[PDB]
Amino acid sequence: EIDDNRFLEVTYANGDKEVMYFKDFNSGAMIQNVVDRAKKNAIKSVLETGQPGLRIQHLLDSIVDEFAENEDLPNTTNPDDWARISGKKGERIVYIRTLSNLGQYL
Amino acid sequence: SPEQAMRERSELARKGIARAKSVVALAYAGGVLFVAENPSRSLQKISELYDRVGFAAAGKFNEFDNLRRGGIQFADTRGYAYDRRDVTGRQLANVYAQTLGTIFTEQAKPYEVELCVAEVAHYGETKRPELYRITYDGSIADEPHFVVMGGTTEPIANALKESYAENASLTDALRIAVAALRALGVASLEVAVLDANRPRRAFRRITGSALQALL
Amino acid sequence: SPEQAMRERSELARKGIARAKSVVALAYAGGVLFVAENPSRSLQKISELYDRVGFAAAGKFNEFDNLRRGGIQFADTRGYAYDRRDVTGRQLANVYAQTLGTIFTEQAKPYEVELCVAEVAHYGETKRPELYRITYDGSIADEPHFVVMGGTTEPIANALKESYAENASLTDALRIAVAALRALGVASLEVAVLDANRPRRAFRRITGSALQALL
Amino acid sequence: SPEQAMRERSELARKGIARAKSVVALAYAGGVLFVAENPSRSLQKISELYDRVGFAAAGKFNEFDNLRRGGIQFADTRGYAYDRRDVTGRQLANVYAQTLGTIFTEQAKPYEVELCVAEVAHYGETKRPELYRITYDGSIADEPHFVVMGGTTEPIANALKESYAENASLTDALRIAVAALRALGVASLEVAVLDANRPRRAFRRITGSALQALL
Amino acid sequence: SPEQAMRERSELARKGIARAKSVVALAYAGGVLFVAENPSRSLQKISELYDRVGFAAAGKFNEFDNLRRGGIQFADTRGYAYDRRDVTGRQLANVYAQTLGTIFTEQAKPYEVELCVAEVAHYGETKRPELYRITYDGSIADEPHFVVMGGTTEPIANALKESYAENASLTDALRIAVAALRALGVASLEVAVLDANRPRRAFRRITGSALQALL
Amino acid sequence: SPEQAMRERSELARKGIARAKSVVALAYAGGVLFVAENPSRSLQKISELYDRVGFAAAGKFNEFDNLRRGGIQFADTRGYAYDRRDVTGRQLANVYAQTLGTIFTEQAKPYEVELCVAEVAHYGETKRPELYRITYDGSIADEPHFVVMGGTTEPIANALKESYAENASLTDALRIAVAALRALGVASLEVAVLDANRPRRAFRRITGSALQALL
Amino acid sequence: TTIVALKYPGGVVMAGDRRSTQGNMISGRDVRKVYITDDYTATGIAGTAAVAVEFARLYAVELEHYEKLEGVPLTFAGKINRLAIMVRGNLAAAMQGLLALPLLAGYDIHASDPQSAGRIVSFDAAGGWNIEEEGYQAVGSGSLFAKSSMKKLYSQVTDGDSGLRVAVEALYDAADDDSATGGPDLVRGIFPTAVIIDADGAVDVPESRIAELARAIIESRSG
């Protein structure tokens, strides 16, 4: 639930607009891409420092670095995910965002 | 269309509250403490409403100052029509709820505002401070310890959740409130109290060098 | 198509009543008993209307409180214009029957409220308690034994159907009503009675330690 | 979209202010100095509002003159209802903000105007000049040194930022203001001051040969 | 365009009246007899209008009770303005026709209602009972023997067509009317008469044990 | 597109002014001279407004006569409310500008009119004649020498540009004005002057045989 | 009725008697006629009891209302003006015998010299007001006797205390020569009421101090 795994912000009309994390979108292809990125990071590490091993830190960093390259999910999911997000919330999704001169706000 | 027309207005109101400064109100030994992040020296977000009833708000100013004025009007008309000790924080909170609901389902644009009405006991009397939060829906919630309004409320609300202590003195509650608000000097803070020890008018601002000493 | 709009108005009102807490009102030996599931300490869903006429509601707070206020206004204007013993629960029910119809056909959104008007006999008099239910349609149903309003009404209505007993004492009717309502402590219950034995004003709240003893 | 419509309104108002002349107001030793680029001899963009409160504007003449008149009306009604020393530049600025928040959201076309309300201290008194700038949206900004309105504000603001000096005399502040405004003779300049040394009415125009000598 | 609205207005009004109880009114020796199928004990579909003029209705209750009240208002204002013997069933019927036509063409929804105005002669006078039926559009029809309103009118109207007998006593006309209405006990019948033998106020309800004896 | 919609409202007004006759007003030794091409003997396009303030117009007769009347109304109400010497051509011009702007933005169709307000000095006084031109949108322009309104203004404006001479007598200015207007006899010309030498009312028509002698 | 007000070096003091009559009949033995309308003013009202108490109440409400809307109290000038407008508003009822005249004491925080920031303001029935400069004022049926007493006693006023003593004495002489003004009741223990305003605001003088002063005066007169 930590804000370190933020994936999308859904602008629910009724307010309390909800933050969808990576857990809400962990598809199998996303998991394979994450493990491949971790493997690439391990390869870079073994080429940089020499030691032949795979670190848990590689996986931990791939967790946060997977979103650096979008997996075609943000703003482009099927209406099934939007429907489920709305059904759980009970409100229509006005807009989704990735994570002036209009009056005065105090 | 029923909910669809209403919900669209709600999204705009929630967005406006998010683009605004944060205010906190918490109970302490001498009453209630309002601490707001406010750069201007003229425009305010904390106000006396009646003898023992205070008021804080966050969101479009032309709107929550309109409510500030309406509430002052109401409270004084009641106090004169009946008596001063008859106006209570509860009535005021209820009027704000009715009024924010009526704006939500009739006016063109919903008031992007969030209100907190506070009340303390009378002089030489004993009773716990009451905090109410009124949202743009017309919803009203009874808070036992503290209210956080405007901006990102989660980190401030959690920091207060760890630091809060009932019967904290004025200085401790000020430290806790500024600390949780950071999650700022006297030139960027608006601080006032509902001092339960005052004989009649309980609201009292803490500015300048006195504020400097307290923090 | 007014028919499509009317069909969606009815569904919207039904959803609002379902999206709310549950209230029950039942006849017992000393009059009528209102038992509502209410967490707040300031916001109330049971009210005195006139000397022997009580009122319970379920739906949107601001709206059924609007009706509460209107009914109080009506009853007092009649009682003063004619006499106290002329205002009856039947008149009140009828006025809320026509006001909810007018609202349901003429206002933008229909009120999402469900009303129950209760009446008992006068002091030293003998007569059966009368319960009326007024829906958002404006339909008025004459109930002989109990009314259940708001939320999911089926399980509560059935539990009451098995447990109800005419001429049950105050404590038994309270146990039956709380039990069927569960299908909650003094900090989450609003309990009041229309005590037929009082000389004039029959409505009487049961709160705190007295409520604690009764349940 | 709802957001797109508000952005379109903002663009129309910005275009009107951009299609106009430039005005500057800056603090100097004797008070505040207004220097506007104005060719006409009858139409003016700088005006007295009250004893110590001045006013400059940039945009559509009929509208900021409408605001000029409304402000005069307001200030005099207050001064007569309470007293002269009670009307402050701060109240006036606030009223203009509320008015430009109501016009922008309620009228057909937003006012394409940029306002600056200025205030100095009373006679024999000591206090820093206050400048407020009210935008067409209804936002108000507290300025410590100078305000630039209308036309290409950024090049003029950049020059004032380098040339400004607190406690500059009237001639130096006039040279700085005309210079930064160029980034024009007495036949194309409207110049007035809020001279803090005057006993009551502080506003005073500088025209003709006296203006000729000063520049 | 108005005629297409009228076609929609015809069906909606007709369907609503069909969704209601059946009422009959017939002439008998002592005047006119109203027999309605009515379960409620508070809500009534038969009413006194003036000294010798009675009224029955079938449709949405809120709308024909609105008409009931309007007619009472009218009749009393006339009787006081001129005299009691000047108000006639014919005037009343005509007013209801004008009002139902205006409602049917001008209001959003047509009153789904069907009216019957009845009149008998004055005391010690001789004259045949008059029945008028006013439909939702404003049409008015003069009936010599009986009127049937609401629900499925064909079988009841035919059964009455075979059973009707002029100068039948009160008991026979009650049997005929209940029989044709069946095509129900004292707990589901609303029965009243326009007794031509009363000195002034002819309308008289027949309820409880007296009704029990008659049927 | 708001700008394009304004362009349509601007083109329609411009088309109306072109679909008409031409008027000129120019300064000469004795004051100001109005020379209009006007065939009718009853309908006039030049008028007295106040003691020293004259008025000429070009466009749609009913509308600029509406403005003529409004201006007369204004000037007399001021002159009576304050004094005669307080009403100036500048105030009048400003009122016409405000009014034509309000009409141009708020009414259905913009006033296809072009106005010229003229003023001379008082008797035995010395001051240059002032000419203002007010266009259909509300724009106002200060003219030093002459104004040309309606029809094709370029050739007349240029011919005047070559022929104009300050302090030309009445006959020379009449020849120049008729000549540049041709770019017509006493039966097709409306000629009037604002003679600065008159004691009070400066406006004076030159018609018939006197006009015949002058031209 | 009689209400005196006098400036002293650094502040202002305002005292009032306690009696209320109907004709020759003594109807109230403990009415309070001097109110604290706000932290820097006090208002005495002579005249009809109803109109008086209502004036005081409504004026306090209005001062505080503007203070809450604008975030700053009116200047002493604005306060003077509002009170004057109320008084002018009661003029018709005053001609009908419902007259109420207020005497307004205040401490101007914005004045230049603190030692002379005290302010006394008197009103007539037609709303005109006047800023007193000879250092003292009074209103009510005993006002003439009170003023003629303070004219002689005023050279003794040098601080808050001596000013209070002089106030109480002036009241004693008002009551001594007029029957509608009640003097110190030694039997029931009812003494005039007093308010002191200085740089720190307005405080009610506690009854004991007024008691001791009254008993000093009474022991002085009897020898």
Author numbering:
A (entry chain C): 489 to 587, 603 to 609
B (entry chain d), C (entry chain 8), D (entry chain f), E (entry chain 6), F (entry chain 0): 8 to 190, 203 to 234
G (entry chain b): 301 to 523
Show the paper's wording:
The cryo-EM structures of the Mpa–20S CP complex reveal the architecture of a co-axially aligned AAA-protease assembly featuring a substrate conduit from the entrance pores of the slightly tilted Mpa tandem OB domains to the AAA motor and into the α-ring of the 20S CP. Interestingly, our structure reveals that the β-grasp domains of Mpa contribute a second contact in the form of the β-hairpin loop between strands 16 and 17, which interacts with the N-terminal H0 helices that form the gate of the CP. In state A, Mpa protomer 6 (cyan) depicts the β-hairpin conformation that is the farthest away from the gate pore in the outward position, while protomer 1 (blue) displays the most inward position right above the pore of the CP gate. These positions are slightly offset in state B. Interestingly, while in state A, all six of the canonical aromatic pore loops of the ATPase domain are in close proximity to the substrate backbone with one of them (protomer 6, cyan) initially disengaged, in state B only five protomers are in close proximity to the substrate backbone and engaged in interactions with it. The loop of the penultimate protomer (protomer 6, cyan), which was at the bottom of the staircase in state A, is retracted away from the substrate in state B and has shifted upward by 25 Å to a more distal position relative to the proteasome gate. Furthermore, in state B, the five pore loops contacting the substrate are shifted downwards by 2–3 Å compared to state A, which results in a translocation of the substrate towards the open gate of the proteasome by almost one amino acid. In state B in comparison, all protomers of Mpa are resolved with ATP bound, including protomer 6 (cyan) with its pore loop now in a disengaged and retracted conformation. Nevertheless, protomer 6 still exhibits less contacts to protomer 5, and the arginine finger that it contributes to protomer 5 does not contact the nucleotide, thereby creating a fissure in the ATPase ring between these protomers.
Proteasomes are present in eukaryotes, archaea and Actinobacteria, including the human pathogen Mycobacterium tuberculosis, where proteasomal degradation supports persistence inside the host. In mycobacteria and other members of Actinobacteria, prokaryotic ubiquitin-like protein (Pup) serves as a degradation tag post-translationally conjugated to target proteins for their recruitment to the mycobacterial proteasome ATPase (Mpa). The bacterial 20S proteasome interacts with a ring-shaped AAA regulatory complex called the mycobacterial proteasome ATPase (Mpa) in mycobacteria or ARC (ATPase forming ring-shaped complexes) in other actinobacterial species. Here, we use single-particle cryo-electron microscopy to determine the structure of Mpa in complex with the 20S core particle at an early stage of pupylated substrate recruitment, shedding light on the mechanism of substrate translocation.
